[PDB]
Amino acid sequence: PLSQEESTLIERATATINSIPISEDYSVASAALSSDGRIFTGVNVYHFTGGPCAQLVVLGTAAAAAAGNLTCIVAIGNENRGILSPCGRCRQVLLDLHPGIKAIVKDSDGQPTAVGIRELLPSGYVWEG
Amino acid sequence: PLSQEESTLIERATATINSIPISEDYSVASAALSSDGRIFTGVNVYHFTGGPCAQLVVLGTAAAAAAGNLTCIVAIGNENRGILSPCGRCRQVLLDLHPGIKAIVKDSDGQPTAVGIRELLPSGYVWEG
Amino acid sequence: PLSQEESTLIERATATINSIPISEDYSVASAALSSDGRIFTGVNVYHFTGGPCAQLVVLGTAAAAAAGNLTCIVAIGNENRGILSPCGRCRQVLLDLHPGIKAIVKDSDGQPTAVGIRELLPSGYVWEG
Amino acid sequence: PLSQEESTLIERATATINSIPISEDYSVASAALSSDGRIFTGVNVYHFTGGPCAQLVVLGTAAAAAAGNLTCIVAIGNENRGILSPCGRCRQVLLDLHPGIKAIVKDSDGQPTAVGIRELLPSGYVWEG
Ligand SMILES: CN(CC[C@H](N)CC(=O)N[C@H]1C=C[C@H](n2ccc(N)nc2=O)O[C@@H]1C(=O)O)C(=N)N
Ligand SMILES: CN(CC[C@H](N)CC(=O)N[C@H]1C=C[C@H](n2ccc(N)nc2=O)O[C@@H]1C(=O)O)C(=N)N
Ligand SMILES: CN(CC[C@H](N)CC(=O)N[C@H]1C=C[C@H](n2ccc(N)nc2=O)O[C@@H]1C(=O)O)C(=N)N
Ligand SMILES: CN(CC[C@H](N)CC(=O)N[C@H]1C=C[C@H](n2ccc(N)nc2=O)O[C@@H]1C(=O)O)C(=N)N
Ligand SMILES: C[As](C)(=O)[O-]
Ligand SMILES: C[As](C)(=O)[O-]
Ligand SMILES: C[As](C)(=O)[O-]
Ligand SMILES: C[As](C)(=O)[O-]
Ligand SMILES: [Zn+2]
Ligand SMILES: [Zn+2]
Ligand SMILES: [Zn+2]
Ligand SMILES: [Zn+2]
């Protein structure tokens, strides 16, 4: 079910996306929890050349703070869309940079659940053998 | 040239990259100034699928703070490499998302100089739609 | 167990990667089958800003021939690596542009098997517009 | 001017894009000349994670054929849009993978002109340099 740390991430990313002007360029926020308990937030940057999803912005934000390993991450869409699953590219970046991470997604009953990244990319390509 | 604002960007970005462990994944920092005078920082996230350069992380960090227009931006590499010119992808995202921005690059003498983004993408493709 | 049309894909992509110079930039070949019976090939283009995987080159090659809907796709690595699973970015693009497609991956016994793209991106992010 | 070589690359790219159904996903074609006397074509694959531009599909298609060095490249938009300049990400990939290449862009009078790739990325970021 819904733990406190999980709930806090959802709350943090929701507040971030709700606080900013409605935009088609900046339309999703993410929040991640680090091993040491810090939370890092970000929003996406839309671009046809592969502007970062919100989760990638969060990864650079976390790395800028020397956060180390991230344990959980969630993305929240604008306009009351709620939890969005990480896109395939996010999943690959997460698997390669934070193999221990979980992402919050909606389960088969619509309920938020924290899932190991490996389960979100079955038979995953692993970069560098 | 070298007006206090830009000198400060170089300082902030240099401080950011020197404060984190040496890494091949997180190896460049960026700092941008917003129109209202705030500074935003970030580091890159290396990935073969196009992990964001440090400047793209900065864009998403500024956007998360509702910073609006960014007016200047610099990237500083780790291991005392100093100023790095924005890559071509960065130039395109900057042109499209912050067309009034300047990027700090090195001139012929290897001295910091702030250049209009359009001068870094001569005959630039301008994204419509 | 697979079919024999999917077997043809493996053979074609194997022949492709073994017919070019060994390269760190161009290291994977792909082949896809169109509903109209044609086979399209491609090799990856490595770049830190997100050079396309071999599958994405295949998509553009198929599109350039007005192929329509692709039904199956496989990647074969150089250094005699055999089948590589689509990376998470490939999976997202495939889900979004050819939602009916299957990808050939290695099963537990190390043998080629065709899997629906949706199975490779569970709880998938649904790109709209 | 309009050299026979320029004119042919433009015609090849134009024919390619004009030959496929009008599409928001596949909307630009590219053609490149190789030093070994071949021409390679491709169309873009639009995706928010950074689906390749037409030029990158061309690079993977050239690589698939063991083309080696490409000497000139052009992109042509659908719906009679004519020549499109390479986007900044294309300029970066081209500078890094084919530093000798020229791109066809429009000049001040709207006429086709071939320019060295380095002219399109002044003060260029030099990958692993
Ligand atoms: C023409 N456009 C593009 C408009 C597009 N409809 C914007 C768009 O589709 N953005 C989406 C792209 C990235 C993104 N995304 C997706 C999944 C995820 N887990 N994290 C993300 O940050 O979510 C955004 C979202 O759903 O609004 C612009 N001028 N920006
Ligand atoms: C094998 N690798 C990749 C190692 C690569 N050498 C890392 C690399 O080349 N990173 C580079 C990619 C992005 C980047 N970059 C470049 C220009 C710019 N204006 N901003 C940036 O953020 O700067 C980085 C840099 O110069 O170290 C990993 N395991 N990470
Ligand atoms: C130093 N480098 C980078 C060398 C890198 N090791 C090359 C590299 O890892 N390329 C990888 C990137 C893309 C890619 N790829 C991956 C999965 C997949 N399904 N299809 C692909 O085309 O597979 C390649 C592969 O496994 O050699 C260069 N200058 N190229
Ligand atoms: C498929 N789409 C996106 C619709 C977009 N308007 C399509 C779009 O803008 N595509 C553009 C993206 C890439 C691209 N491009 C650009 C420059 C260049 N030198 N080569 C290219 O291949 O050219 C395309 C073009 O001008 O139609 C959605 N479902 N949102
Ligand atoms: C690691 As958790 C309890 O925030 O999904
Ligand atoms: C702060 As400035 C003059 O480098 O755009
Ligand atoms: C022929 As098949 C099952 O690999 O799409
Ligand atoms: C074929 As050309 C003249 O644009 O290098
Ligand atoms: Zn993503
Ligand atoms: Zn960049
Ligand atoms: Zn891929
Ligand atoms: Zn491009």
Side-chain angles (χ1 to χ4, degrees):
Chain A
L2 272 299
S3 67
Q4 188 58 250
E5 25 280 300
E6 276 179 358
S7 173
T8 304
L9 246 26
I10 297 161
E11 296 177 35
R12 287 293 297 274
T14 303
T16 301
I17 195 57
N18 291 350
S19 67
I20 71 168
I22 300 176
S23 172
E24 280 182 281
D25 295 324
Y26 314 123
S27 63
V28 178
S30 174
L33 178 62
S34 69
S35 268
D36 65 27
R38 293 134 92 195
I39 295 166
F40 300 92
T41 58
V43 299
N44 74 301
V45 175
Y46 190 93
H47 201 263
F48 79 87
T49 61
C53 287
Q55 296 86 324
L56 303 189
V57 169
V58 165
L59 298 203
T61 300
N69 300 155
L70 299 179
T71 58
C72 193
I73 189 160
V74 68
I76 303 287
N78 71 1
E79 300 194 289
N80 294 322
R81 284 183 294 154
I83 288 151
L84 304 177
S85 296
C87 86
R89 188 173 75 160
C90 288
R91 291 177 195 205
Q92 188 63 52
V93 183
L94 292 167
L95 177 62
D96 290 329
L97 292 181
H98 289 106
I101 203 168
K102 303 186 91 171
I104 297 170
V105 297
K106 282 176 173 193
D107 70 7
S108 76
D109 302 302
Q111 296 300 285
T113 184
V115 175
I117 187 64
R118 262 161 201 101
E119 281 60 56
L120 297 169
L121 274 181
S123 313
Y125 174 79
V126 184
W127 192 58
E128 288 174 324
Chain B
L2 194 78
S3 190
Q4 241 278 130
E5 307 259 31
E6 67 244 56
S7 178
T8 308
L9 253 20
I10 296 159
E11 292 182 41
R12 287 288 298 284
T14 304
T16 300
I17 196 53
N18 297 346
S19 74
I20 76 174
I22 299 277
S23 162
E24 300 198 77
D25 300 317
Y26 317 119
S27 69
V28 177
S30 175
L33 185 72
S34 67
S35 71
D36 76 358
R38 288 176 283 167
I39 291 161
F40 300 90
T41 61
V43 307
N44 79 122
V45 179
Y46 189 91
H47 197 263
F48 75 87
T49 61
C53 290
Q55 297 92 322
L56 303 190
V57 175
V58 165
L59 264 54
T61 303
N69 297 162
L70 295 183
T71 64
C72 194
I73 189 152
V74 70
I76 299 304
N78 65 1
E79 292 171 314
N80 305 298
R81 288 183 284 151
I83 295 166
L84 303 166
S85 285
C87 85
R89 181 183 63 169
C90 280
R91 296 176 193 202
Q92 186 70 49
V93 183
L94 297 172
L95 179 61
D96 292 326
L97 285 179
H98 291 110
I101 204 163
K102 294 178 258 202
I104 297 166
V105 297
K106 288 196 288 186
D107 68 11
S108 62
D109 287 14
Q111 294 312 301
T113 184
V115 170
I117 197 69
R118 275 170 195 89
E119 312 312 299
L120 295 173
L121 275 182
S123 175
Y125 171 82
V126 287
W127 196 61
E128 305 305 310
Chain C
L2 38 46
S3 80
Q4 84 96 41
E5 234 177 353
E6 54 190 285
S7 158
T8 300
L9 289 186
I10 290 165
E11 301 166 351
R12 186 69 70 80
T14 302
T16 301
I17 194 59
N18 279 280
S19 71
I20 74 173
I22 296 170
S23 173
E24 283 195 288
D25 299 321
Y26 310 128
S27 60
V28 177
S30 181
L33 184 63
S34 179
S35 61
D36 64 38
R38 292 182 285 166
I39 290 165
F40 295 96
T41 67
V43 157
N44 80 118
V45 177
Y46 187 91
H47 199 267
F48 80 86
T49 61
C53 283
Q55 297 95 316
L56 302 191
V57 178
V58 168
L59 297 207
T61 302
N69 83 109
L70 301 175
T71 61
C72 194
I73 194 168
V74 64
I76 303 290
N78 72 357
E79 302 296 330
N80 224 26
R81 287 177 286 164
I83 297 165
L84 300 178
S85 301
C87 87
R89 186 192 55 182
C90 288
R91 297 173 194 208
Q92 191 66 50
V93 181
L94 293 171
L95 176 57
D96 293 327
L97 287 182
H98 293 103
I101 206 172
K102 292 173 184 178
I104 299 171
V105 296
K106 278 157 82 183
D107 67 17
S108 273
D109 299 339
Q111 303 310 299
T113 188
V115 178
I117 189 68
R118 290 178 197 275
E119 274 59 68
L120 297 173
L121 268 183
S123 305
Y125 170 72
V126 175
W127 194 36
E128 276 148 7
Chain D
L2 202 67
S3 76
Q4 181 55 52
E5 291 83 2
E6 284 161 356
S7 176
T8 302
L9 268 193
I10 291 155
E11 156 67 26
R12 295 298 318 285
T14 300
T16 305
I17 190 60
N18 292 349
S19 77
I20 74 175
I22 296 154
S23 176
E24 293 193 297
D25 298 318
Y26 312 119
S27 65
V28 176
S30 180
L33 180 64
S34 67
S35 63
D36 69 14
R38 296 184 281 172
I39 294 182
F40 299 97
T41 60
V43 302
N44 77 302
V45 178
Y46 187 94
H47 200 264
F48 76 89
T49 63
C53 288
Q55 299 94 317
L56 304 186
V57 172
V58 164
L59 295 202
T61 299
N69 302 314
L70 301 175
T71 58
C72 192
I73 191 161
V74 65
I76 301 291
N78 69 357
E79 304 202 284
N80 314 126
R81 286 185 288 155
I83 293 157
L84 304 174
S85 300
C87 86
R89 181 171 75 164
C90 282
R91 295 171 194 207
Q92 190 69 50
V93 177
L94 291 169
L95 174 58
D96 289 338
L97 293 178
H98 296 285
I101 207 168
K102 304 188 179 292
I104 299 175
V105 294
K106 287 167 110 171
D107 64 17
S108 285
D109 299 62
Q111 297 313 288
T113 201
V115 295
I117 190 58
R118 284 172 189 88
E119 300 177 64
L120 296 177
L121 275 184
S123 168
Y125 172 80
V126 169
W127 185 60
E128 210 62 10

